[PDB]
Each structure stands twice: as structure tokens, then as C-alpha cells.
Write a protein that binds this ligand. Structure first.
Ligand code: FES
Ligand SMILES: [Mg+2]
Lengths: 135, 86, 14, 49, 26, 225, 100
């Protein structure tokens, strides 16, 4: 027979009960496969409701330590002339190169961001990188 | 079931009800597991678990539905609106 | 049981 | 009148991959014409009604 | 554990608040 | 006397192994990342029920957690293979018109069925009247896109549940996975992501069907001698 | 020594790009409908740009072109809506053809 009450339980809970009660003479083909390897969440219908008052989503903004460097670099120099190639997974941009050198100089033991930022730019200039400031 | 003729209404409702079957858990196949108190819209139904031999002491419509489910012993009080659909 | 008059062989019978 | 043949065998599996659309013949034709247009793009009256 | 997990900061890319032409002028 | 042995050696045997079809090798977290499976919609398009699967928001762009996708994808592919091995009818449903041609080819290649067109009301809940009294409905429905073209759940998601048909579904950050049996959180917009799904589901189905032929043949050869 | 997903995300080219506003990227024309050019730059959605009149003939399927990204996804919430309306498209300006 079957049960079309898609809002009451799941397809398995409904099917299992009807097979047990004897309404369904033969269990469906997928029944045995479902029971052996069930999903992580049982597919039960649930109604979405609006968040009211102080309820907020638990999704958090993804930030990293180097975002402080990236934000500063983009403000000082702007978008590098080299165009971002997002197709290449190993592509390194001028900003990424700056972060890398900045981090390398941080390992040396520099504690001043401004001084460390200045030293980072100087190292890149020596390597032949073109750093045209917005000014 | 809806139809101009009463026979067509009887048939439609009867055949369609079979595709919308619940499964009711009966304690020892004669009563409910625990007392159920609920409000559907404006209808209040308060069902109580009862021992064997108590019988069906509830609203007549509930008696009919209980016999179809297989519940033998239960008490229920219907308050608020006595709408048959609710 | 109240017996609903049962339908005959489909009249349309395409 | 020209009647369409049975579209599924004894096992019950329909014979056409677009059977469940209800218009397997029509949608199969649309699929073919769309395919030809794709290949043509990648490669590149009065009497008739 | 792992050091690549996101950390909690205030939006560093957040732009400064806009100001009207008369902001700070009597 | 022979039917029980046949069923046990063929039908019940695969159900005793965790990965009978070895779908683990088909994909890795690296391969999923290279296909942009983790790129979700903007935070303002987020569906409340998709929050458990979202790793976070990178500049107001939800990032789907690929560590959950791997476990969710593993279960969906396993279920798909077991259904193809059991000679079940698999139906691919999708209303994204950028991929209608691709999905219709993928179904024809793996010997399955696709419905990429406008879904007429009652295809599943009124099939015996639309197709015929002896029509057989699908045993599995794989949603490559669960939303219709007005950004609402595809009607077949509800109708499949009414007909007690299990469903596999790629659910982006703006989808509702409550009624999908085997939801797979992932990007459903990028061609690379959709192409990867098609390759993964086509391979699992083809492998499962071939394994069914190999097992049956061995059982028959041994039966004679 | 298996790379975790968090490691992949931190070092992804899209993450190091940061805000996409006014970032020059390289796309590929994957589909062309009359003058409308559909370009893929590696994001979730593609960007649609009109065929430049200066050298329209050069822009063909597969041609790599330079873009200036404005938004990864065009979305907005309008009066009375419970969720954002999404165009399923990115906003970008076609600068020219990439030449090596
Ligand atoms: S913005 Fe108007 S007084 Fe500052
Ligand atoms: Mg999407």
C-alpha cells in the first residue's frame, strides 16, 4: 500500500512500521540497503522558522592572522599589477609573496609591525618586484 | 471525500484513506503507552492510559477510531470546539 | 457493512 | 490509429532514458537537435513549409 | 592540534565609515 | 531450495561489507576542493537547515565543510552503488538548464534515466494514470540540483517522499535538506563541481552493474559443476 | 600526513585574494551567445560581458581575457523578502585579452 504522509517520520520509519503491521506484503528494494548503511540524519520533515529576538546563526567569519597584513598591503599598494589566476591552485600573488616575506621576517624576531612592514617591502624591492604605491 | 453524489464521496474517501495510514504504538496491544494531552487548533484532547477491562470511555468518534486502531481500554475528554475534522 | 454500489466494467472502455 | 508500442519490458525497466518525462519522443528530439547545435558551434525555402 | 583553523578577529578589510562634507566643521 | 541460496550468495552478501564497491577510491577531499565543491552562496541566501554543514563565511560567502561532504558523499555513493547492483531504476532530476544536456547524456551512458525538463504535476503521485497501471516507478532519485528555477525546492523532493522513494541530493547553502534521504552538501553551480558529481555517480553505477554480472556468472559456473 | 581541509582553505588562491572588489583576474570565455560573452574566472559563478567592439572577432570560446572583479555573486534583498534575490552571476568588467 504505502503511506503518503511525508510529514510524519521518515520513509524508513513509515515503511518499517507498515511492513511490521503486515500492510506491506513485501518490503521495497531499497529497504535492506537503507538499514545496512543508514544516513547520518534520519530524513524527517521539519519546518523552517524565523529567528526572533537574540537568536543568531552560529556561522562564524573565517579570518586568519595574515588578513591583517593583506588588508594593510592592499591599502598601501593596492591590487598588484599581476592578475590573479585562480585556476592554478599553486598561484602566488604579489600580496601572498608579501605575507610570506613578512612571516619570514617575523620569525627573525621583529616585534614592530610598521618596522616589519617596511622591512618586508624593502626585501621585495631588492628581489625585483614592482611595488608602486598608490601615492 | 468530496463529490456531488454521496456514493462517489464514500468511495473517494475510503480509497484515499488507505494511502494515508499511520501506525499507532499500542502498549500490550490494548492501550496507549502514556497519558497524552494535546490541543489541535481549538480542540483539546486529554487521553489517559487505563488497565485492561476498563473499556472505551471516550467521545463516540474516538471510540470508532480506537476500534479501527485496536485500542481496547482508554479514557479521553474532548474540550473546546468539538469539530470532527480537528 | 453498507455496500457502496460497485462500478461495472468501465463504460468508456477505450 | 497509429499506437505507440509498450515502453517497458517484463522486468519493468523502461526502454528509453527519457521515459519518465512522459514525452520521450519529443524530448529525445529536442536533445538531439541541441546536441547538433553544440557540435556545429564547436566546428565553426518558398516551396518548403 | 591544527594551526590552520580560522581565528577570531574583527573584519580587517572593513572600510572606514563615510563622512559628510561638513563633518567636523562648525 | 535454490532460491534462498541464490539470494544469500548474491543479494545478502554485499550487504555484509562496509564498502563492497570500493567507492572510497573514487574521490578525495583534495579532488573535491579542486572542483570548487566548497564554494557556497552568500550568507544572505543561507538556509537555516544548512548551517550544520557550513564551515564558515569568508567575506559573506559561505564555505561548505568538505570534511562533512566526504562522509556524506561516501554514504550517498555507497547507497547508489548498492541500488544499481540490485538492478534498481535510478532517475536523475535537475532543473538547471546549463547542465540539462550533460545530465541527459550521463544517464543514457550508465543505462539509467534522467528528467531534466519541466516536471509536470503528478508524475510520481499519479503515475498509474499518466503512464499506465503496470508502470514501475524509480527505486532511487538523485537530485543534482534540488531547487527549481524560482529558487524553491523541486516538487519531486516532496513527491518522492510521498511515494517512499529514497533520494540522493546535492544541497547547496540555500537548499532545504530536511526531506532528502542522503544529502550531500556541496556546490551545485560551478561546472567543475557538477562535472565531478556526474563522473562519480556514473562510475559508481557502472561499477555496480558490472559487479552484479561478475557475481552472477561465477555463481552460475559453479552451480553447474 | 594528509592535508586537512582547513589547510587547503587557508592556502587557496581565492582566500589570499581577499575582497574581490577591484581585483584583476584572468577568465576564459567558455560559452558565447551572440555578443554576450560568458567568462569563467574561477569563482562560484561566471560573469557576463558584452563583446568589445574594438576587437570582437578575437573573443572566441576558450580565449583568455582580463577582468576587473566587482562582486563574486550579485545578490540583494528587496522589500518584504525573507531571503536575498540572487542573479546566479558575478559582476565584472572586461578589460581586454590576456597575452603571454
Ligand atoms: S558624518 Fe555628518 S557630522 Fe560627521
Ligand atoms: Mg548553489
Amino acid at each position: 500500500a504505502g503511506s503518503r504522509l511525508e510529514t510524519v517520520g521518515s520513509i524508513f520509519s513509515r515503511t518499517r512500521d507498515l511492513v511490521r503491521a503486515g500492510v506491506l506484503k513485501e518490503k521495497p528494494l531499497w529497504f535492506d540497503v537503507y538499514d545496512a548503511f543508514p544516513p547520518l540524519r534520519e530524513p524527517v520533515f521539519q519546518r523552517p522558522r524565523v529567528r526572533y529576538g537574540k537568536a543568531k546563526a552560529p556561522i562564524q567569519d573565517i579570518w586568519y592572522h595574515e588578513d591583517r597584513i593583506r588588508a594593510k598591503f592592499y591599502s598601501v599598494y593596492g591590487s598588484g599589477q599581476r592578475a590573479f589566476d585562480l585556476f592554478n591552485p599553486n598561484f602566488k600573488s604579489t600580496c601572498q609573496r608579501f605575507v610570506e616575506k613578512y612571516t619570514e621576517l617575523q620569525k627573525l624576531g621583529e616585534t614592530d609591525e610598521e618596522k616589519l612592514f617596511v622591512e618586508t617591502g624593502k626585501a621585495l624591492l631588492a628581489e625585483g618586484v614592482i611595488l608602486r604605491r598608490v601615492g | 471525500g468530496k463529490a456531488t453524489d454521496r456514493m462517489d464521496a464514500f468511495r473517494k474517501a475510503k480509497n484515499r484513506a488507505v494511502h494515508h495510514l499511520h501506525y499507532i504504538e499500542r502498549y500490550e496491544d490494548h492501550t496507549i503507552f502514556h497519558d497524552i494531552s494535546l490541543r489541535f487548533k481549538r480542540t483539546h484532547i486529554k487521553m489517559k492510559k487505563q488497565p485492561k477491562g476498563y473499556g472505551l470511555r471516550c467521545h463516540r468518534a474516538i471510540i470508532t477510531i480506537c476500534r479501527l486502531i485496536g485500542i481496547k481500554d482508554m479514557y479521553a475528554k474532548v474540550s473546546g470546539s468539538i469539530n470532527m475534522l480537528s | 457493512a453498507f455496500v457502496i454500489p460497485k462500478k461495472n466494467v468501465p463504460t468508456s472502455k477505450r | 490509429p497509429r499506437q505507440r508500442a509498450i515502453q517497458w519490458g517484463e522486468d519493468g525497466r523502461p526502454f528509453h532514458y527519457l521515459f519518465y518525462t512522459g514525452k520521450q519522443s519529443y524530448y529525445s528530439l529536442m536533445h538531439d537537435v541541441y546536441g547538433m547545435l553544440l557540435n556545429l558551434e564547436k566546428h565553426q525555402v518558398i516551396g518548403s513549409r | 592540534s591544527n594551526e590552520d583553523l580560522p581565528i577570531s578577529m574583527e573584519n580587517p578589510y572593513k572600510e572606514p565609515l563615510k563622512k559628510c562634507i561638513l563633518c567636523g566643521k562648525h | 531450495e535454490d532460491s534462498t541460496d541464490f539470494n544469500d550468495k548474491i543479494l545478502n552478501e554485499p550487504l555484509k561489507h562496509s564498502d563492497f564497491f570500493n567507492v572510497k577510491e573514487l574521490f578525495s577531499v583534495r579532488s573535491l576542493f579542486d572542483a570548487r565543491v566548497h564554494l557556497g552562496h552568500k550568507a544572505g541566501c543561507r538556509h537555516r537547515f544548512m548551517e550544520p554543514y557550513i564551515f564558515g563565511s569568508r567575506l559573506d560567502h559561505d564555505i561548505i565543510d568538505l570534511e562533512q561532504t566526504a562522509t556524506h558523499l561516501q554514504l550517498a555513493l555507497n547507497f547508489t552503488a548498492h541500488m544499481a547492483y540490485r538492478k534498481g531504476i535510478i532517475l536523475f532530476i535537475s532543473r538547471n538548464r546549463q547542465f540539462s544536456y550533460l545530465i541527459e547524456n550521463m544517464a543514457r551512458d550508465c543505462g539509467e534515466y534522467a528528467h531534466t525538463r519541466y516536471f509536470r504535476g503528478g508524475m510520481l503521485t499519479n503515475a498509474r494514470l499518466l503512464f499506465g497501471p503496470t508502470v514501475r516507478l524509480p527505486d532511487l532519485i538523485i537530485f543534482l540540483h534540488t531547487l527549481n528555477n524560482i529558487f524553491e525546492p523541486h516538487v519531486a523532493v516532496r513527491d518522492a517522499a510521498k511515494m517512499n522513494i529514497p533520494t540522493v541530493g546535492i544541497v547547496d547553502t540555500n537548499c532545504n535538506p530536511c526531506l532528502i534521504t542522503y544529502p550531500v552538501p556541496g556546490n551545485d553551480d560551478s561546472p567543475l563541481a557538477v562535472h565531478l558529481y556526474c563522473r562519480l555517480f556514473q562510475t559508481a553505477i557502472t561499477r555496480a552493474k558490472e559487479k552484479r554480472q561478475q557475481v552472477e556468472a561465477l555463481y552460475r559456473l559453479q552451480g553447474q559443476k | 600526513n594528509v592535508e586537512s581541509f582547513a589547510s587547503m582553505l587557508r592556502h587557496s588562491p581565492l582566500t589570499q585574494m581577499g575582497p574581490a572588489k577591484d581585483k584583476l583576474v584572468i577568465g576564459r570565455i567558455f560559452h558565447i551567445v551572440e555578443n554576450d560573452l560568458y567568462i569563467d574566472f574561477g569563482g562560484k559563478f561566471h560573469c557576463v560581458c558584452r563583446r568589445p567592439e574594438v576587437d570582437g572577432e578575437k573573443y572566441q570560446k576558450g580565449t583568455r581575457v582580463r577582468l576587473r572583479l566587482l562582486d563574486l555573486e550579485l545578490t540583494s534583498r528587496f522589500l518584504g523578502a525573507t531571503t536575498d534575490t540572487t542573479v546566479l552571476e558575478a559582476n565584472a568588467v572586461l578589460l581586454g585579452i590576456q597575452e603571454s
